[PDB]
Each structure stands twice: as C-alpha cells, then as structure tokens.
Amino acid sequence: EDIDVILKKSTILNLDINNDIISDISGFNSSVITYPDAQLVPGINGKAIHLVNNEESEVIVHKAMDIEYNDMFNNFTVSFWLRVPKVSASHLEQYGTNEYSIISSMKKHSLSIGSGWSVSLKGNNLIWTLKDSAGEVRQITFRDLPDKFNAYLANKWVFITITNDRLSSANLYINGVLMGSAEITGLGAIREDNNITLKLDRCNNNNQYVSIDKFRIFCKALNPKEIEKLYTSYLSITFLRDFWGNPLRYDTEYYLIPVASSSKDVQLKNITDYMYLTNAPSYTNGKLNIYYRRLYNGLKFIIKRYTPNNEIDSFVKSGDFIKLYVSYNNNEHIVGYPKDGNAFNNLDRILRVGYNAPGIPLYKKMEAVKLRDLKTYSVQLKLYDDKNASLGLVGTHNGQIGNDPNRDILIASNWYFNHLKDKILGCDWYFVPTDEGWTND
Ligand SMILES: OC[C@H]1O[C@@H](O)[C@H](O)[C@@H](O)[C@H]1O
C-alpha cells in the first residue's frame, strides 16, 4: 500500500491548529478544551501549542467514544513535534531528579494512581511510561546527547514517535531514528483516563515551559518506513527555517553559523572589507555531563525584502529575492560583491560589507533558497549581478588576502552547484536568533 493511506487510515487523533483554534482533524471528532493560559506560538508548519507551569495552561482532549478504549490491549503509536528549552546547569542541579509529565492519559486526584501512559521529562531525560491495571510498569528512559548544539531536548523542534507492540516492545524514535526501547510483554490491560491531558504535571520549576504540535495517535505500531515518511511529511520546503526550526523572518537579527563547520562563528575584518570564520568559545560541565559551543557571538545579520510587489509577508520564502545586511552598532551595512572585485582565481568572489567605492557597481541582490538537506534547519544564499547572472552560492574559501593570516573567507561561487548532493557542503548556513530557551551557562 501507500505510506500515506495507512498513516491517514490508522490516525485516531490528530490535533491541528486552524483559525487560532485547536481541534481534532482525525475524523473522529474528539472534543478538545483549551484552558485560558495555553499559548499559541510559531511551529513547524503553522502554529503550535505552548504550555507554561500553572493550572490555567493546559489542553484537554476528551476521547470520543469510538476510540475510548483503543489502547487497552491493542498496539498504538503516539507522535508529536516537541520543543524543550535547554536546561540551565543550575536547573539540572536543582530539579534534576524532578520527574514531571507533559502529556498523559493517567489519573491522579481520585484514587486510581495512573494506569495509562505518559510522556515525562526528568532533567535531560525523555521518558515514556506505560502502566497497567495491576500497577506493573514499563519505561523507556532516553538520555539526551551531552553536546547541546546537536541534542534533541535543547531548544529545537524535534519529531517524537513512540510505537508500542503489545507482543514485543515499545520503541522511541527521534527525527525518524530509533533511540530507545523496552520489552512490554508482561503488561496486562491499560485502563486509562477518558481524557488525554497536555499539561505540566508535578513540575517544581515555576518557570518551566514546553511546546508541542501535531499531537497524533495511530491505531498500530508504525514501522520505520512509515515513521520516516510521516516525519518528512511535515517538512514543507517553501518556508525557510531558523536554527530552532521556527520560520525565518525578515527584519530580525540572526547569527550565521556554517553547517559544515558548526564550531565556527563569522567575523568581520572591517567596514568595507571581508568576513571570515573564527572558533566559537564553548561551555563544559564534567559533573553534570553537558557541553556545547556557546551561541550568540560573532556577526549579526538582517534579511530585508528586496522588493514589495503585492503581499508583504513577515516570513522569508524559498526563492524570495533579498538584501543581506550586517547589523553592527545600530547601523546596517549591505553585503555584496563589487564589479571586478578581488576573487580567488577569477571565480570565488570575495564578499564585502558596506562597500561604497565611487563609480563601481555593487552587486547585492541575493535569493534565499532551500536547495538541499531537507531535515536540517539551514539555508543557502545565491548572489546575482545586474544582468541577473549567477555570481554563485554564499560559502567560504581557504586563502589569504594581502598580508592577512590564512582564513576561511566568505565568498560567492558557482562551484557549489556541481556538489549539491554531497553529504556535507560549505554553502549551507544556520540562522540563529537569540531565544529565551537557550541561555549560555
Ligand atoms: O515580503 C514578500 C516577499 O516577496 C517576494 O517577491 C520578494 O522577492 C521578497 O523580497 C519579499 O518582498
């Protein structure tokens, strides 16, 4: 069959946000109740749900009769995009042994004691737990990667999927890749609450928050192929993304980091001069087992709309023509390539910032595109001259200018169009904005 048909046909619950309202679009009409303090924020493909730590911040799903008892004995899969802020080193020391649910089908203020399932967080652990009638429990404890730049519970949108085969195991997938599992034989009936609660439950950190989107339940244990297509079905390729996975926007500051050399920052030699790579400083914590390259150092860039022509959108679409500026000291300096400007061997054109030589054409029309690496939150940039001929993709070239030190210098080159299939490529960029979910320790 199709992966599309069985994904759709096994869907039993599907939360979608339309017209700023949250409802189940599965076909089963489970009623959804949004409390006053459940917030809506930018998501993966539309808006997403945002929960803070108070009793008014919650979204409840009252299961339709027809799907009431679907996970009592049968196989099921839960899927959703998740965004959790990077945990501070102090919060790992304070609340690191504090386990709190964020999504659950279990009861608590009656006397039941939670037969059912739950998605919970505990420091830098993602935990799936299933509990049956007898109080027997099975758990998957996923321990996140220690390098926070590449971790899954460190402020980027990530796609979670947990399948449960009652005859074998429960499997936890992150961005389509199997990352944890537990044998679930020995469990009896799951006799859970009639409501599925999205809420922070028993979290001691008053400032904790999480974002969730596309919460979906399937009536089967999905296989790896189905999971992969499902994951990729949300990655709409028209709207560019920032480093966190949210929509890239015009008129906002972004730090640039080259995807192929993620430990480097971008730096300016000078006004009217060139840009080059530098090593980012990093944070390490042996005791808590966490480390990362620090963010927010090095140049800030702004993307401006190159023309209006009708509808003005605040999001940048692939193919949009733009003007790129370096945002320095409250001033903004255009990035471009002067007519016969310095280049490496008549072909890697050296980019210049705020160049203004009298009488010399300065080419600065760029096109923001998504030409490769779909799952990665990165962007490519193409420069044009005034005959609308391609001057190349923005990348870096190793070399020296005058008597300066050898450096990886920012350039525009048509040479990258011959290598778009490579696994790793020098013309891919991450656009990083400052965010409350990531503060350096
Ligand atoms: O804002 C909407 C966008 O429309 C595109 O046509 C244009 O190339 C962009 O620069 C921007 O204006």
Same domain, 192 and 230: yes
CATH number where 357 lies: 2.80.10.50
| Residue to mutate, 302, 317, 382, 384, ligand 1, most ligand atoms under 8 Å from C-beta | 317
Angstrom distance (rounded) from CA 132 to CA 134:
6
Same domain, 304 and 424: yes
Helices (H), 139-223: none
Name the phi and psi angles at 209, rounded to 5.
Answer: -155, 160
Same domain, 109 and 225: yes
Same domain, 230 and 253: no
Same domain, 196 and 240: no
Q: Cβ(211)–Cβ(51) under 8 Å?
A: yes
Same domain, 200 and 257: no
The residue whose CA is least distant from atom 5 of ligand 1 is: 320
Closest CA to 413 of 374, 380, 379, 373: 380
Of 187, 216, 235, the residue that ends a domain is 235
Same domain, 257 and 191: no
Helices (H), 200-281: 224-233
Ligand 1 centroid to residue 312 C-alpha, Å: 7
Angstrom distance (rounded) from CA 422 to CA 360:
36
Experimental approach: X-ray
**Total number of domains in the chain:** 2
CA 383 → CA 79, 220, 344, distances in Å?
40, 48, 16
Containing structural domain, residue 204:
1-235
CATH number where 110 lies: 2.60.120.200
Q: Is the CB of 320 under 6 A from ligand 1?
A: yes
- What is the full DSSP assignment across 325-383? EEEETTEEEEEEEETT--EETTTEEEPEES---TT--EE--EEEE--S-TTS--BEEEE
Of 235, 253, 277, the residue that ends a domain is 235
Same domain, 217 and 247: no
Q: Is 88 exposed, middle or buried (0-12, 13-18, 19+ CB in 10 A)?
A: middle
Same domain, 283 and 188: no
Q: Is the CB of 251 under 6 A from ligand 1?
A: no
Same domain, 298 and 323: yes
Ligand 1 centroid to residue 304 C-alpha, Å: 9
